[PDB]
Each structure stands twice: as structure tokens, then as C-alpha cells.
Amino acid sequence: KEKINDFVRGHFHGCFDFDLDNTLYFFIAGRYEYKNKGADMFIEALARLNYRLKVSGSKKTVVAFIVMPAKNNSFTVEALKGQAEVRALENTVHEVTTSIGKRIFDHAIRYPHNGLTTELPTDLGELLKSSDKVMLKRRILALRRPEGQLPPIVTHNMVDDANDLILNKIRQVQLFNSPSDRVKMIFHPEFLNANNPILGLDYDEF
Amino acid sequence: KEKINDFVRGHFHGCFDFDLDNTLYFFIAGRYEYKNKGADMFIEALARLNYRLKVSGSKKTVVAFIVMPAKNNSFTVEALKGQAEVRALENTVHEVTTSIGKRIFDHAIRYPHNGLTTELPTDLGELLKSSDKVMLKRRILALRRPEGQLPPIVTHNMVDDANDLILNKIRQVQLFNSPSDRVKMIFHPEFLNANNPILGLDYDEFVRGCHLGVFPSYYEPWGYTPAECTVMGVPSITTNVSGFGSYMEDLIETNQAKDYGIYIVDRRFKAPDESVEQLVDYMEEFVKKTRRQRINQRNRTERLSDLLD
Amino acid sequence: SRDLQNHLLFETATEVANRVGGIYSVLKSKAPITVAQYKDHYHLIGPLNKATYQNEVDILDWKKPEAFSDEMRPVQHALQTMESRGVHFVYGRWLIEGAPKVILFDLDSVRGYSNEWKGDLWSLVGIPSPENDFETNDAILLGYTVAWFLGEVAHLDSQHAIVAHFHQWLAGVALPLCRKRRIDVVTIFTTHATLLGRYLCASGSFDFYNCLESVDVDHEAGRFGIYHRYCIERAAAHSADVFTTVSQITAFEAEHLLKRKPDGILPNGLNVIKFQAFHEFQNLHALKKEKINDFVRGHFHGCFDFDLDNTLYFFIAGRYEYKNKGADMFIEALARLNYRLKVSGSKKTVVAFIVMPAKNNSFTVEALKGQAEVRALENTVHEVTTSIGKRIFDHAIRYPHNGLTTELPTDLGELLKSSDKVMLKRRILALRRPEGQLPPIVTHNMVDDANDLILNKIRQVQLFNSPSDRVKMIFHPEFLNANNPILGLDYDEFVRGCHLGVFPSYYEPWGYTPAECTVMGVPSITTNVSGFGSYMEDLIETNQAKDYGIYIVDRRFKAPDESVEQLVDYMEEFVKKTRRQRINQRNRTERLSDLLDWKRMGLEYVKARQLALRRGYPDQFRELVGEELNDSNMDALA
């Protein structure tokens, strides 16, 4: 689940308005047989669930995955960039927390000497310096997405996007991953594999 | 030097009121020859240095090490506990900063949604929870020393503590690592070795980490000790009755030699109390230096090591 | 009765808070000494970039009484007058070292005035301003707005003498207005190039440096469709109390093309970041180089057949001006260098980066996936070594019991299990690339790949990053920034990581690009027709200059083909160096930093301001100093 969470933060970079501790992960998968496999029904019911949850005031979020193979030209640049920007924020946080550590540690070892009156730091300024703040703010800027751009409904560039049965159905029911939709939609038109650059899970693990 | 610091924090646990970024490490090392290796001058000089630094209101600290083998029953319980107590605080801080990490990250990735008005957290309470505080306070309590206990002057249990020349001399001059002393004494009665459980450095590594060797020898036909020290780019005090000192004295004009990290005490044409006062003048002249001055002096000392090849 | 010692300074430029090129770098790097000297009397001025000003400018409240002193009070009243005629602006601290107060004017806020202002410029200066050109529109708007502003300050303030300094023709429309309106300020104009000089060199046809005196400026300004802009630049240079360039090369050029001999040179400085340890810059080189190594490994996944420990990194960087910045010579020289290195059997590898912005649709999927593929292998390796660790540890702690007869494991199989081998082999497969596919020569998808000048030149010389090529090419058509997903470095960091900067410019009034390398202890190749190269050539004997990491290519007194061969000689001489010799050359390069510090260069700006005050108020200057001093130029006065 935590690897799924990693992908999902990247996919929703700059539009991340829900708590993953209160998010559920539904999926459909198999060969791309729109009618036979239930993909038409799945997408329809999710749209009705999305309406149902909004009405009842639910705080849950469903992220729904479709894993069926379609003709594509690999992953979108947005799917990969989002992943990299998140990875980059992580690494920046790790540098900052390492500094925080040295400052907490010095305070702890020195108390109660040199005018330290509390066992621990009380003010965030004792731990978090302006250079630390600058690089975090830059990492946050990298994750911002354009005015009115929503999290996409597909992870790849499709050969025939305009005629695809699953995408046209998602567009018809109007699940565009709006912030007010409690049900999110992600079509992944490739079979899962641990060498996948965005979601490095084999299907069984996923 | 970071490995020495790590040892010093342990040694001074519950008594750590000075700044390691502004602490210098002096050492003497060799065979236990109290008189011939100058250990008596060294300790006597340090006690006078301590006086001069206190009077001048200097905020610097010198921690002097004596590395000379004496019969012992290995490390004290105190030495080992402090090392482990400090590690235990390290690991607990590492847990807590991992937590702080998750919380900073969440805020960063989530901004500006769900009421996050600032890009970063501003209140420490968002990052540091009460379970985290309880852990850290417990580690801090483990580091507390009993009322009125001072960091020891020795790391080991000694076979004949009461008749040991070095410890008798340290106690005679009353260098007991009191908080108001700006000079600290640590006698480590065993050659260094990276298997050592409290200061896991071999000797060459230890020397590199230090700031100044002090080797006021009285009988010393060569003096391999300051020579090695010079080869590691560490400045050092020697004497004109040491063969290393005699050789450098003849090879460089003595006021210029201080620039290349070679201080030479005169023990041949001066009364002992004049030699001690000169040794203090050199130590005090070195403490005064800034970091940039220390760095460039080491550079010059390292060049000088071509001459000993 | 205006005070000459306690005076205001107003510095005006289009790049005041948005990077276009080197002028941004001048104003920024120069702010610490300028603020140190003036404090609350200094103000930068420019056009408000409504899009990008958010990132760099701290917005301040100019209306509160606390935001100005009482001697500086007139500047507030002047801004309150501009408000009461509807001129919108922004007051703020620029978020740089120095922290200088800025005044950015909204050019949309006076756009209604365009036609009567364009007309006043025609009738009362002479400048035809065809409506087509949105650049010369915005220059006229800015210039009229600023001359209006200084007009108010000059009337409302009666204590301070005022120095108005302006950089480039874009900010120089205010100059003729201050002269024509007899406004009580003294003006400096600094030009960082010439319009005609760019365009003459760009059309890389003729021998500009030697055949300069014989160009008909009116004919030539005509044929380039530049005359209306050339006329602004000329009026700036002619209307200023003091006129300056940045280099002697450009001074020679501004004499003959703008028709006024400059009063002196304002050579460009850097804000020299000292370290407490001199050697700290060497450590930074090795840190930043490792991040470049990380990128390279991804770029060459499945085609990685060289040792990065025996690989050097050359770069050219700058705005996309193919002839003027010398991208042509660079690519040509690398191709010959490749041939020399193959012939002499060299084991070294050179990876050449070209960092020049071009129209693009972001990074290729390929370049991103490789980074992801390499990062994924790294983590699998980390997993595998953790397990290896448990196993060495068990062996070591158990020895010599339970039949462990040697202190350490001897067979790999004790440590590396088959499940470990299976995941490592999967990651190796993900890095594999199809039969015959070569590492790209470019990291982005181009708009107009087939017509791009750099790509066509790389194709012409056939540097396709083949395994037998000892020189590799990577074109990165965007400026570097630490949020970049494939090479997460800021430009300064990347420069520290590299080994050699290569900037064989034909047209370069100064060239901060090699100067920035020098300050970072990175050797650079420049030319004798560049401001920086001419300047350094004058200070160091040209063979000694190579040992301090200042390689200068002769593009004045040599045929273009001799220059290419000289550039190649330099590259090959550098490639032959051992590591020790590289480390020693970088130290020698670093020592030259002091020569480029603003603490030295910024004295020329003081001479330029003194001369303005000496020309504007001769009587007062005389009685302040004691003699009638020579005002003919900057050095004659000092």
C-alpha cells in the first residue's frame, strides 16, 4: 500500500487535498474487453458512488485503478516528472531533518548549561534555519501545477486517445479528478511490473 | 576530529557547557617516562595556561590528552556508560527526526489545501509530538551526573592510582575538569587503537584529529613523536634537548619556525621555571589563533614534512 | 545648493528583476558594495514583470511613514504624485545579498499615453517609432515614466545631488528627456554592447574587429531593420553626462558605431564568496561532480563503457546565439578533438554539455525513464547490500564456531543468494536498450528538431555518441535549475562540478560565463575579442595564463581554421593532464578571484559617478576639492 501511496502523491502533485490514511484503493484489471470484463459498469458505478458520497458528506476517498492493456506510446512526461519532483522533495526533507537532528542533539547534550532553561527546543526557529526553508519552498514550487489543471485520468500517451472505450466512458461520466470528486480515476493501460518507472510493483504485489 | 568530539561529549556527559567548534585538542604521547618525556612540564604548564585563559576571559577550551601506557585494569564503567548513553541519545534523535520528516513532507506536499496557509510548518507542535518529547527527556535524564561530580581525569582503572606520577601531578595542580577551568585533562593510560571501545581511533588518526602536539622532552636522542606529528600536518612543541628540536632549530630561525608549526622550548640554557613559562607562552600563543590562522599554519607544517622524507 | 558628497543614486535597467543575460548578473552581484556605500539612498528602477516578480521581489508597503527617513522623505512624495496620476508600481527589497530597495513600474499602467509620447519623441528628438515593434514600445513607455519620476524627485528634493545611471538602450529613452527638459540630475549611460556590433558579427560573414572603422552606420543600421532602435541607443550615448561601456573592446566599438568616445570602462565584477578554508571549493567540485556522474549514468544506460574516474566534463553555456557565443567552433573543435584522441589511443573520455535555451516541449520520456531506471537499480543494490551485511555480520560474530573455519566469507554464494540475483538481473534488463540504439545527443523534444542550428552541426560532424567516440555530446536546451528532474543542479553548482568551461565567443562585450568559472576555480577557454579575455590578457602573460586556467583563443589575428585548431590544441593539452595537475591548476585559478571582486571593480563606478557630479556642478565641485580638475574622462579626474 505504501508503494501505491508513493505513486499517488506523485500523480496528484499540487492537487493533493485528501488523507491517504482515509483513502481506499479499488481496482479492475485483465485483458481489454470493455463489455465482457465489466469496465463499462465499473466506471458507471464509480460515478454513481461519487455522487452518493458527495451527498452523504463522506470524508473517504476512493482512488480507482484500471489495469488493462491498450496501444500506447509509453508514459506521459507529466507522470514521470511528478514522480521525480516528489522524490526530490523527499531527499530535500531528509537533508533538513538531518540538520534538525544535530540541533536537537546539541540542545539535549548541553542542557541545562549555557542558559538552556528547557530540556528541549521549544521554538521552531532553533531547529529550522532560513537556508533549510529556502530549499523546501523551491521543492514545493516545483510541485505546483498550472491554474485549473487537474490530475490526469491516464498515465500514458494513447495511440488513439479520442476513440478509446475506457477514456470516452470516463469523459462521458465526467470523472476528471476534480478536488470535490470523492472518487478518483486512473487508467493504467499496461500490465504492471516492478521495472515500471512510476509504480514499481508487480501485479500480484499491487 | 569529529571522532574525538564524539568521545569528548560522552566523557563530559551531564557537564557539557562549552563549544566544540571552539575547543582545541592538545596531546602528549609516548613511553611513560614522566621526567624524560616532559609530562611534568606539560601538566605544570597546562595549569598555568588554565590561569591565563580564565583571567583573559577567553571563551575557548583546551582539552589535553595524555597517551602513555601505565598498568591498569582496563576502562572504567563510567567511561563506557557515558559513551553508550550518548549513543542512545543519538538513536532516539534519529527516530524523532524521521517522524519530523514525515510531518514536514506531508505539509509540503499538501499545501495549500485543507487549511494550510503557510508553505512550511511554523509551530514546533505540528512536528514534535509528546511521545517524541518523553523519549528525548528520558535520554537526557540518563546523561545527568550526580550532584557535584566532575568529569574524570582518567579513562581507566589504575593498578597503583595513589602512586601514579601523572595522576599525582594532575591532582597536585588541581586540574579536575571543573566547569570554570578552560583547560581539561584526560589521561588515557594505554596506546590508542581502533578496537578501543570509547575512542576508536588508531594513533595516527588521533594525531590528525588533534590541534597541537606537546612534547617537552628532556632526554630524547631523536623524537619520532614530534616528527610523525609534523608529517601529519599537526603543529607541535618540542625542546632544544630533543634531537628533533635540535635538528629543526639549526634548519630554521626559531621565530620563523613558529609559523611552520614548530615551537622549540629552551631547556638547555634556561632554568626549569623559565622553560615552563616559555611552554605556556607558546600554548597561549596558539590558543589565540583564529581558525583561518590554524588552517594555514597546518598547511605550512605539511609543506615542512618534505624535509623529513 | 545641492550636496555632492551626500547624493542619491538611481540605477535603471530592464533586467532589474528578471534574468535575460549578463546585465542581471551585473546589477545583482554589484548590489552588496553599492548598498554598503549608499544604504537608504540607492534605488534600482525597471519595468514590472507581472508574471515573475513574485519569486525575486519582497513586496513592501511604501505608504507608511516608517518606510523612509526624513532626508529620504522626498522619494515618498514623488511616488505619491505618480499615484495621484494613476501610475501603478511596486516598491520592494530584491531578495539577493545586499537587499537593495527597488521601484518597478507597471508599463500597462501608462499604455494609453503611448501615441503622444511616441510623437513627442519623434518631434523633439527625431526617433521614428513604427508601431510594429513591441520592444521599442516598452522602452519608450519605461523611459517617459522614469524621466517623469526623476523630474518629480528633482523638484521635491533640494538637499541631495542626484545621480541617474542607466544600463542598455532599452532603459535609455529617459536620457534624452532629462537633457531636453533640463532636469536637475546628472546622468550616466552604460552600454553593454552595441546593436550594430551584434548584428554585424551574427551574420558571420566579415572581419568585424579589423574592418570596423569602414562601416557606414546608417546603411548598415538600415539593412538590418534596426534603425529605429539604433537611434535610441545613439541618443542615450549622446545625451548622457557620462557615457561608459564595460570593456575596452566595446569602447573601441561604441566610438565608431555610436559616434561618442566613452569616458571610461566599467569592467564587470563578481560577488566573491570567500570560504574560511581555501580548499573548500575543491570539496564542492567533487560533490557537484558526483551529481553530474548520476545524470550521465542515466543518460548512457545500456551504453556505459567508460570510467567516470577517467572522464572530464566540458561545457559551453549561454543564450542561443550560435555564431556569437561560438557554439559552432565548440562543436567543430570537439569533433577534431575526438579524431585526435582516437588516433593517439587516449583512454580519457570527454562529455561535452551545451546548455543553451531553445524552443522545446520539455524532457524526452527517454531521459526521464533512464534516471528512474538507474534510481531503481540503486535501491535494489541497497536492499541487496543490507542482506549481505546481515550475512557478513553473522559470519564474523559466529567465528570460529559451527564450522566457520576462516574469519571471513570466501565464496560469494555465502553472501549473494538467488532471490538477490533475480531482482538485480531484472533491474539490469530495464537498463538495456534496443540493438544499435545510441545515447541521445539531446535531452528534450525540440520544436523544429530538423532546423535547429546546434543539432544540425552535431549531425554534420557525426558525434553520435558511438562507443568508439572519445568525445560525447549532450545538448540541454534549457537553463539549469535545481528543480530540473534529470540534472538537479543550479547553474553555479553544475559549473563547480565540471572540469573545463569553453566559451569561444566571436562577439562578447564582457562574458560573465568564463568569469564565473574563474571565481569558482574552474579553468575556462575564452577569446581575445571578448571583454573578459582582453582584460585578463592585459594582466597575465598569455602562456602563464594557461597555468592559472585562462586559455585565450586568438580570433582577431588568425584565420577561423587556425583558431579552431588552437582551441583543439588547448582541449587536448587539458585532456593530457593528470589529476594532480588538474587539482593544482584549479587552485591557481581560484587565486585569480581577487582580481574580479567588485571590491576592486566597483571603484570604476565611483569614478563614473564622480565625473557626472564634476560635469553637472563644476563650480561646486571646484570649491569642494580645491582645484579645477580635468573632466575629460574618468581616469583624468582620479
Ligand SMILES: O=c1ccn([C@@H]2O[C@H](COP(=O)(O)OP(=O)(O)O[C@H]3O[C@H](CO)[C@@H](O)[C@H](O)[C@H]3F)[C@@H](O)[C@H]2O)c(=O)[nH]1
Ligand atoms: O544555465 C545557465 C547558464 C548561464 N547562466 C547565466 O547567464 C549569464 C550570461 O552572461 P554572459 O556575460 O556570459 O553573456 P551575455 O549576457 O549573454 O552577453 C553579452 O552582452 C551582455 C549584455 O549585458 C554583457 O553584460 C555580457 O558580459 C556580454 F558578453 C551568466 O551570468 C550565467 O551565469 C544562467 O543563469 N543559467
Ligand SMILES: O=c1ccn([C@@H]2O[C@H](COP(=O)(O)OP(=O)(O)O)[C@@H](O)[C@H]2O)c(=O)[nH]1
Ligand atoms: O498487470 C497485470 C494484470 C493481470 N495479470 C494477470 O493476467 C490475467 C488476467 O486474466 P484475463 O483478464 O486474461 O482473464 P480472467 O482470468 O481475468 O477472466 C490474470 O491471471 C492476472 O494474474 C498480469 O499478469 N499483469
Ligand SMILES: O=c1ccn([C@@H]2O[C@H](COP(=O)(O)OP(=O)(O)O)[C@@H](O)[C@H]2O)c(=O)[nH]1
Ligand atoms: O597510542 C600510541 C602512541 C604512540 N605510539 C607510537 O609510539 C612511539 C613513541 O615512542 P616511545 O615514546 O616508545 O620512544 P621513542 O621512540 O619516542 O624514544 C611513536 O613512534 C608512536 O607512533 C603508538 O603507536 N600508539
Ligand SMILES: O=P(O)(O)OC[C@H]1O[C@H](O)[C@H](O)[C@@H](O)[C@@H]1O
Ligand atoms: O574531478 P577531478 O579533477 O578528477 O578532481 C578530483 C578531486 O577533487 C577534489 O580536489 C577532491 O577534494 C579530491 O578528493 C578529488 O581527488
